[PDB]
Structure 1
Amino acid sequence: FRPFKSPLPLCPFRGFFPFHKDNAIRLGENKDVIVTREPYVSCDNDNCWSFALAQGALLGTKHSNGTIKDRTPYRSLIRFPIGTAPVLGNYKEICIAWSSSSCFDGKEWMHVCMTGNDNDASAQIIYGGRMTDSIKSWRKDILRTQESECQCIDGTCVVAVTDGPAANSADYRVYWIREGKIIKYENVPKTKIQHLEECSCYVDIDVYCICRDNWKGSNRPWMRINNETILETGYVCSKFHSDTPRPADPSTMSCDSPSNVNGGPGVKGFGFKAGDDVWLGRTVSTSGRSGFEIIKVTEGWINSPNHVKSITQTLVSNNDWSGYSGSFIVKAKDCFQPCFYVELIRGRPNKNDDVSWTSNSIVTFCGLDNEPGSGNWPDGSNIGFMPK
């Protein structure tokens, strides 16, 4: 017997440490590796797992040509051992999906899988391997979700979902799902949040989601949620913004609205509230998806004149490609450990990646209450060695 996961507080931490790295593109030189993108990580009682949206093709084969395309019927959410490259001999196919979220409730896995036509998509809810429920597109404009792990408290899982325009007003909802059955949803209040995509969430008593405003906000919108309702919303106060693109530091302190500067598009990212402070992942570049660093901003969660970047860890150099990033948690006795993954995109449309495909590798870090060292953990592939 296993109990449902509880509303534990986030563990104390003061730095992030290298965890698992798959080197998937390097290992894919001989065409063994499945083409993926939008990876994430999520753990159950026994294992942490890599998840990603496969493209139904092997890296470097003719079918991998043109996998820059975001949505096809040939995409499936797949799962593979954390830190391993996804290959036919080790992967599991979770569901047909070109957008997804997964989370373990303490007893079983839940997955949310969107597929079908852009104007008529549906989200399948999988629980314990069985399709238990669904969401029908209501705005008929690319129904979509987090692309990282959802969160579950006392048996009720929470997941953020969007339907509508990428660069205009759309609908954003949170769904509460218990044992695979949709209990209720709420439209996210628009009193502060103006656009919301690809939420990266974690648990610190309540669920916190830090997301992507793809329209007007170079700062990231956020929500606080429990097993019943949305408790709080806003934008991360930090005058050091963390979307891409974004203005150079220092920028505007906007706790309650989008910055309105360098607003679109964006990239999936994450953060961790720590008291009044906030940790924020971000590309090193302010314009491109290159490099990765995480900063701690003193009093960055609140309205304050005292915002300072007290810590900056540079984990992937600006000379290396990054991509999406997202939070995940690991139960650590009486608290949840904050961890994250970074998608390292290789191929189109990256300048000088002269291949016809698009894929990624993964690297991950976890938070400890110890002082970190330093290093650099990029994709590491010589694109010139790769089958095109």
Structure 2
Amino acid sequence: IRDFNNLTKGLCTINSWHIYGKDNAVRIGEDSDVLVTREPYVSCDPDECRFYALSQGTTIRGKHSNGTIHDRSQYRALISWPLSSPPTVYNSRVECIGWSSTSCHDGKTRMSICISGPNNNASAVIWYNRRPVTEINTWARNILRTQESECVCHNGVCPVVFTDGSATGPAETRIYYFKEGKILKWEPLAGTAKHIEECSCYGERAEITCTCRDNWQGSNRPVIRIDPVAMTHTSQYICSPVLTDNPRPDDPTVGKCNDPYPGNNNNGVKGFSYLDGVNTWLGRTISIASRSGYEMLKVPNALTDDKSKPTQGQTIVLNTDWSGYSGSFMDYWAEGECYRACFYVELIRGRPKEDKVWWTSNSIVSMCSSTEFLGQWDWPDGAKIEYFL
């Protein structure tokens, strides 16, 4: 718009899900100059919504796609392209160079942060209106990381959650408040959460909600709620027995609000949730051991009630199909009474599970929320690992 954005609405009644975006990137990339990506996401400008994702600097088909299972390198770069077109060599815009990103638009223009570096000496640089403004060098010296999906801004201020430290144990997570590229302040993570990675965040009624990842001990997901106005936050867990991280222990009868739920240590998968009282919906893979299938569950009050079991659901990716990372996003500039909630599901094709090929790319699926009850379909990446041989 030509004015900062204020999250003035609340979420709309989430009664079912309608497909919003489909990539088909790996299927088309078997015969088009498509980029190998991973860690995908979706963010909207006032003007348009786009698929964002971390490039690997090669095409699926090019011989340099070999060994793209490695997450970080100097060939990675946050890139961006039209809603539902593949991430083609000829239509991707490079947003900045790095192997961890987050990107959001504040009403006036957008902030993109790409983190780069060796693991022991990494730096974040905060791009604003496509020029580097601020940079933040490492603080704990072992892999500074961030969101992996869009951030949310209220009146110029965008909280961005960063973790620096070990994924196996206590790490230094700090919440930074930027406004227009400059750091307005930062505080350290406070609350009952025990470890923070890859926070999926959305914003309503002047407040920001982030479902993150507990990599050390959590199988239930930790939640940070940030007051963008007062520049404070808190962190608790999702009480619900409906465990949503992956791999996970099987779901209990009663769960744990102020602590990690035991069972699968040193692992996770980025994930999201829509926490709105009765209108709460959660999403987990269907498999407890692997990233196969992805499903949405209405679990009224899952944040707060520690025996909330699901009342309505929706199958998104079939359990005989692969999934991966998920994250929240909304089109904050779309017309209406409220926020249409939406999310995305990375579809990881490649190594390690499908190691007949040596690349790891992924596809993207997006859905937004309908007040209706629309019927459901499953949405497969779709490629046959056998035509690339």
Whether TM-score is above 0.5 comes out as yes
Q: Secondary structure at the match of 1:356?
A: coil
- Equivalent position of 1:58 in the other structure: 59
Q: Secondary structure at the match of 1:267?
A: coil
Alignment of 1:199-238 (within 5 A): 199-205=199-205, 206-227=207-228, 228-238=230-240
Matched, 1:183 2:184: yes
- Equivalent position of 1:6 in the other structure: 6
1:329–1:338 contact (8 Å) kept in structure 2: yes
| Matched AA of 2:123 | S
1:276–1:301 contact (8 Å) kept in structure 2: no
- Equivalent position of 1:348 in the other structure: 351
- Equivalent position of 2:143 in the other structure: 142
How far 1:336 sits from its partner (Å)?
2.0
1:347–1:357 contact (8 Å) kept in structure 2: yes
Q: 1:132 to 1:334 in 2, by over 3 A?
A: farther
| Matched AA of 2:26 | I
Query: Under a length normalisation based on structure 1, what TM-score does the superposition of the two structures give?
Result: 0.96
The separation in 1 between residues aligned to 2:7 and 2:317, in whole angstroms, is 32
1:197–1:213 contact (8 Å) kept in structure 2: yes
The separation in 1 between residues aligned to 2:32 and 2:338, in whole angstroms, is 41
1:334-386 CA deviation, whole Å, 9 max, x = no partner?
Answer: 42221000000000001x45101010000000012111211110101111012
Q: Secondary structure at the match of 1:367?
A: strand
How far 1:277 sits from its partner (Å)?
5.2
Matched, 1:299 2:301: yes
Mean CA deviation greater in 358-367 or 25-34:
25-34
Equivalent of 1:266 in 265, 268, 272? 268
- Equivalent position of 1:313 in the other structure: 314
| Matched AA of 1:55 | Q
The separation in 2 between residues aligned to 1:356 and 1:304, in whole angstroms, is 43
Equivalent of 2:283 in 277, 281, 284? 281
Q: Percent identity?
A: 48
- Equivalent position of 2:105 in the other structure: 104
| Matched AA of 2:322 | W
The separation in 1 between residues aligned to 2:266 and 2:220, in whole angstroms, is 11
2:269–2:325 contact (8 Å) kept in structure 1: yes
1:301-320 CA deviation, whole Å, 9 max, x = no partner?
Answer: 21344x12111211101111
How far 1:33 sits from its partner (Å)?
0.4
The separation in 1 between residues aligned to 2:319 and 2:289, in whole angstroms, is 11
Query: Under a length normalisation based on structure 2, what TM-score does the superposition of the two structures give?
Result: 0.96
1:157–1:178 contact (8 Å) kept in structure 2: yes
| Matched AA of 2:129 | G
1:236–1:300 contact (8 Å) kept in structure 2: yes
Aligned residues: 384
Q: Secondary structure at the match of 1:379?
A: coil
The separation in 2 between residues aligned to 1:311 and 1:126, in whole angstroms, is 41
- Equivalent position of 1:358 in the other structure: 360
| Matched AA of 2:204 | D
- 4+ residue segments displaced more than 3 Å: none
How far 1:251 sits from its partner (Å)?
5.1
The separation in 2 between residues aligned to 1:123 and 1:223, in whole angstroms, is 21
Mean CA deviation greater in 143-152 or 370-379:
370-379
1:277–1:302 contact (8 Å) kept in structure 2: no
| Matched AA of 2:224 | M
2:278–2:299 contact (8 Å) kept in structure 1: no
2:176–2:185 contact (8 Å) kept in structure 1: yes
Q: Secondary structure at the match of 1:26?
A: helix
